[PDB]
Amino acid sequence: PEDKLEFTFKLYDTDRNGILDSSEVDKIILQMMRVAEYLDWDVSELRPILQEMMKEIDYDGSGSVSQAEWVRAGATTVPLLVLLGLE
Numbered sequence: 001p002e003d004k005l006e007f008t009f010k011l012y013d014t015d016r017n018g019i020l021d022s023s024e025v026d027k028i029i030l031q032m033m034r035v036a037e038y039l040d041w042d043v044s045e046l047r048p049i050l051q052e053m054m055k056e057i058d059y060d061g062s063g064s065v066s067q068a069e070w071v072r073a074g075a076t077t078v079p080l081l082v083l084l085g086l087e
């Protein structure tokens, strides 16, 4: 999955600076919300959950998620591609 996670990172890094800052993470969260709603889940209190998940993925507390954090998380503890509806 590491090459899939790297491919997907590059799609959300719209300014191509190699990190996902807050507004780009926010886009990722909204896509995960749209996937959940599409499946007709109850999304009432899902968004605070997705935010805290992404806070944790920022391992070094930089306010941004680097490619290595994104890949490390998506390949070990969190099914990022499933949540985005990509897998």
Ligand SMILES: [Ca+2]
Binding pocket: 012, 013, 014, 015, 016, 017, 018, 019, 020, 021, 024
């Ligand atoms: Ca960026």
Ligand SMILES: [Ca+2]
Binding pocket: 058, 059, 060, 061, 062, 063, 064, 065, 066, 069
């Ligand atoms: Ca970081």
